[PDB]
Symmetry: D3
Subunit: 256 residues, 6 copies
Amino acid sequence: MNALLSNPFKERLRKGEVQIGLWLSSTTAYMAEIAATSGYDWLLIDGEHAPNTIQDLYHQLQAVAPYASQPVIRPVEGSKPLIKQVLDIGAQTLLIPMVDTAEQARQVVSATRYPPYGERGVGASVARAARWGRIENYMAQVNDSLCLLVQVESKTALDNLDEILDVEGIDGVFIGPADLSASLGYPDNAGHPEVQRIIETSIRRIRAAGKAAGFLAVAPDMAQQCLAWGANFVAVGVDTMLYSDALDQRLAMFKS
Amino acid sequence: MNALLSNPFKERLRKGEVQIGLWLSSTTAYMAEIAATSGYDWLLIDGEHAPNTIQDLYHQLQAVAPYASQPVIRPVEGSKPLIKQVLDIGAQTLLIPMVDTAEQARQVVSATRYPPYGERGVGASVARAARWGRIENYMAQVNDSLCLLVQVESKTALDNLDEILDVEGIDGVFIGPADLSASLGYPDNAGHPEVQRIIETSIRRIRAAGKAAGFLAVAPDMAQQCLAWGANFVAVGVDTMLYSDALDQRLAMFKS
Amino acid sequence: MNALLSNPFKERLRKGEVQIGLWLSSTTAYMAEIAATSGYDWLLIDGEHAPNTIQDLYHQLQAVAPYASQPVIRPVEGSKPLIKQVLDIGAQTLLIPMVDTAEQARQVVSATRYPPYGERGVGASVARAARWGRIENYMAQVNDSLCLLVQVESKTALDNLDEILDVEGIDGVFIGPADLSASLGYPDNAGHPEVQRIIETSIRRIRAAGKAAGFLAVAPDMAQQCLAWGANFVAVGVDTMLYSDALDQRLAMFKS
Amino acid sequence: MNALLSNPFKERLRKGEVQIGLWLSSTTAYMAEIAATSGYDWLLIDGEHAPNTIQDLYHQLQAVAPYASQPVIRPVEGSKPLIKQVLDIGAQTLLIPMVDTAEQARQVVSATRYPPYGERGVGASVARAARWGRIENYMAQVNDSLCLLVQVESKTALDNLDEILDVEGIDGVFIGPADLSASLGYPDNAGHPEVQRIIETSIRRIRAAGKAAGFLAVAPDMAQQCLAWGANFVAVGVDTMLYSDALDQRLAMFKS
Amino acid sequence: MNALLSNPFKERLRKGEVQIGLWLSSTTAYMAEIAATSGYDWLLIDGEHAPNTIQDLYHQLQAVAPYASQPVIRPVEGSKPLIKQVLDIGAQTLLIPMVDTAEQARQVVSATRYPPYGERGVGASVARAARWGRIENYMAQVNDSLCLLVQVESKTALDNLDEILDVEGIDGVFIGPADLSASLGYPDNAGHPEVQRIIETSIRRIRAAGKAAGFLAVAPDMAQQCLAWGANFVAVGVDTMLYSDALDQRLAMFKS
Amino acid sequence: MNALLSNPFKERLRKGEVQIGLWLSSTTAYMAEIAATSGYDWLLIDGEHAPNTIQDLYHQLQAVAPYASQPVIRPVEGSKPLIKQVLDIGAQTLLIPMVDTAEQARQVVSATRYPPYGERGVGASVARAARWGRIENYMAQVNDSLCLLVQVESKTALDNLDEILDVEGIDGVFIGPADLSASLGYPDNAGHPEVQRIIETSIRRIRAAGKAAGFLAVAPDMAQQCLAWGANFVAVGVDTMLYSDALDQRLAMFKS
Ligand SMILES: [Mg+2]
Ligand SMILES: [Mg+2]
Ligand SMILES: [Mg+2]
Ligand SMILES: [Mg+2]
Ligand SMILES: [Mg+2]
Ligand SMILES: [Mg+2]
């Protein structure tokens, strides 16, 4: 097998390319493989808001591996040890929740990088990340193939957006509209013109800074709008929601 | 908790009532609970064509238990020991594949009944089926609450349909259109007029014999047609197919 | 299904009713279901002193769901991300260990509330807590249906007991005799007059603040005593201890 | 490690010693370890009436391995492949259900022995049975350390008892009184006034033919009786029953 | 994704290429993936002599899927329902143990084929075999991409070897030295001149019929010999044996 | 069962005996048992750089329990709650990563001791640590049987080595050469020509302060050297590395 790491999601992001994603929220490797057969550009394995253990995450990576869709892992939080776990299992693209400050953003980057630059503990070289040694010179190759995406989803984070965007090692900034809406004084209502204005300017600011801009839009109209605004890693649904809706729609054909 | 067993699916079947179902093919308790929130009348936990162990089946029963949707279990085959396993875990409604003869149908019934009448081994009385003893006089109550559905899905089985329909202990006969189509000399094409004619007469014969008639129709048009013909336990989709289709439909909105 | 949240444990607690409970310590969904058939008022699913993963917790919730006994979840610690995980899986009643200050208690409340009331990140809409959107207006209903119980189980905690009892959003204070005893310099001797004294006074003070008073007593004598002292959410047993004792007692009939 | 096979259960059986046992019915490795700390002489890991997979059986063997209590495995049925599976995982004592004829008993014996004497499939050096080759000359050692117990628990099996007792390789004959009573036309109450005699005579006949005699008696009164009669491998409880009873008993102190 | 079935193992086999393989005996997806990074031509996932459930088999397939090594699945026995399960999860190459007669061999082929060609029940359309409908015209493509290997590993099997080699649908015949040796009256002594002789003649006869000839040799000397004799699907190791030996060899450097 | 705690690893450490170890990196109970049959002195169950959940850790302890090899658990980090979890499951020897200061070392020691001396949460009588109460006076016995090893593997930790060595309750100090080399500015090649001296001096300093000295050396040449220097708990391989190498070596015989 190949001795070079590659991260196709990162490669595409660097080329400015638009990547269409789906949230995977069931924790199950069975459904992750099924979802991978759809051909989304990326799949967000949600270790934050679905009850995934580190083993569930591992199994979902193994499930999607031979398919074209690229996995992105969101851990429970961007702490040193939880980041350590997901990087060692060979998650090359991370989405980190609740990044509110440039200092938090620098600490997240430090957690992903080995000494000199960061604080990542050594051990991937004999784990899935270096494919048990088949990846030669893993410590030398790794930074170029790691892709780091941070969520800006509070009023504090928007206030700090420029500082965060200037942090070395951050590849993209993701806006989660429902948390942001809540924090801005409009809980349960991202549809308010103030919120929409903030979302649009924030996306444009992220792209203007040369970084990738991300979004989750479960309403296709909102997804089209964020794409128009320049978001270029956009998740367009949550698998469990698509599932439940499909189930309801089929059943409705037979019930009065 | 209650000392009486009840099988609402059987109660409704006895009353002639139409019951709308969905196949569950992921093996996962996580998705089974999600599907149960839809409100289908029944959910077919497929131990035949999805890789369910006896524990997967157990977990899916525990998942759906507090919801209104009634579970129906299909084992890998209707052998004595596999039937034994699923009855002891408290699956009160079974769908048995590949029942081709009245003798096979009698043997299936014998597998579900304790001595005098049948060959079921004792032990449920301390298992999930009798809720570890909370169900009093389980051996006396049980037959009235067990619901047995058999699949007629070959040319041999159709030839034997009258004999099968006269077998004591059989509550319903299910027609699987794709196996039947194959066996009738039309593989991959249930849409042939010969096959449709056989399906319609078979449904009408089953109802004319006072038994419930079942069908799986993944095309809603076919489901409506089988309902019109008198099928009264009709599965109208496979959850994994509904899932994949929903995923494809969402993605298509963003890809040219 | 039902679109409304309810919390029977919390309604009873608010009425000042005595609720008799049991610790579940095996991690197993299989034993959780068996225990639920006893009809204890509540079952404490122990994620602190038994090796439960978030998945084990989930499966135990699924197991007890159809039965009348109400689940309570104790996480390994009361941190923001661990509280997030248990809320999202739909645990409506939490027992939080080692709450030592009014500040820690406020932080715990904040971890359970969405903006503006706290720090809880959204995502329960696409998870078990909101039954995948079947619970309508979850964000609006949720605070009413969440029951928070905090453990006062150190010397520091006792010093701050009045300050803790004044924290809005705390429904009950639970005295942990094993940790408290040790904290006081009487490890493994909770029966000491000095400890029994402090337990009694602590219980009366909790109730005097209009909050529920909780306790675990593995000795029935002690359980009746703490009930006489005013404790109204009282766990009276640990299931693994009851198992071991029952097995020993049966064996001893044939070894003597 | 130790290169010798030993079977303390079989050695004590051969000495005619009385061995006191407990059914393990939860399928869980967690409860199997807890139960092993009681020091029963044997623990019956029930793969017939509890929903154990071969993996669950493996994990319960691993759990109990360091304790004094000797494991006995009952598979779902005594087929060649299912006996092959449980022998390969290092189950050295088997309890086989539904052995109704001498021809069946011979076929079970052959399934436990390698060719050319029997039909056990050869591959134990790549499994736990030979501790991955740490047991030297496993194929030489294995017959002497394997203990075969069959269940005679039907009318037909009773009619065939003498003949079954003449089959070489059977170490013990187990009578299940609830199965036999059902088979004799007494569904539940277990051993009725009518079949006590039929049971006693059998126990005495079994011991008379130089074989061990087995029984499960969940009533201590009945267990004393069967021992008085000559039964020397007697299971005296079912762990899930002992659990439920103990939970009920502790709770009744507070609903009193 | 790709809508076409292919079987690289089968294409190579048809070309008469030598394919070097490894037994996987741990049941673990974790070790299966590690093994796949070695680049053996094939990996034998052993459901006969290791305690694999259908789920363990599934997870091992998912693990090795992205790597070049091609999986082969051996079920616990070659029965119709066990073959059904492994085909449906998408195992394209099967190794069937203990095929003793031309009749058994025909039955195995029939178990792998849909009507009119055999008895296989439909349902792979909604399973991993057809990648949930992403493989278009599965029913039409499938026979071409299925590779059947049968074990000739008893005296009965040898007597019927020519009849077995004449069965249409068999791609390869595998000689099992452990079972064959025992069947011949030389258990645990496959090295006996009489056995080595019969292995050699058997290999030449297999190849003479235009079928592939298979073998497992845990001794490299024997492996080279069987290759020299004409065997072209040759497993050369059992992964758990290689693990144990490697661990012993490292330890021995510090114990001597 | 035996009511006394013992820690053979700690007893031998105290005697200054040399103990030879192996890293267990696969997370699987199946491989842990196989590895235990080699008779290494100790086996490091790696919960920091392999994706172990607390349940995986539990199952590997259960697997190795009856063998002579002594288990050592490394948790993801040495936080209070994670040390609480692993102590409660009966891990009596801990290896704690990233111990950089004396204050950290004191905080780790306190996390291992009950109040009022430390801050370990009290609940071991409802867990495996006290074998569910079969270990009498566990709280009395526990300090003497717990063995605490800390990792000093960074520039800061090195600067602080004397002070760390002065902390009471630390039984051994482990040096990880790849982490330290990275921290000192040598990413990979592990221990470079430049840091051998820094390593040797540390090993001698550790033993000089009356503590045990630890090392992982995957190169046998380096392992002999560190032993020559005074290291007395030395891991000499990583099981997944030994596996991969052995697989490669066997395969190379046929790609030759
Ligand atoms: Mg968010
Ligand atoms: Mg069918
Ligand atoms: Mg406590
Ligand atoms: Mg029986
Ligand atoms: Mg063989
Ligand atoms: Mg390190």
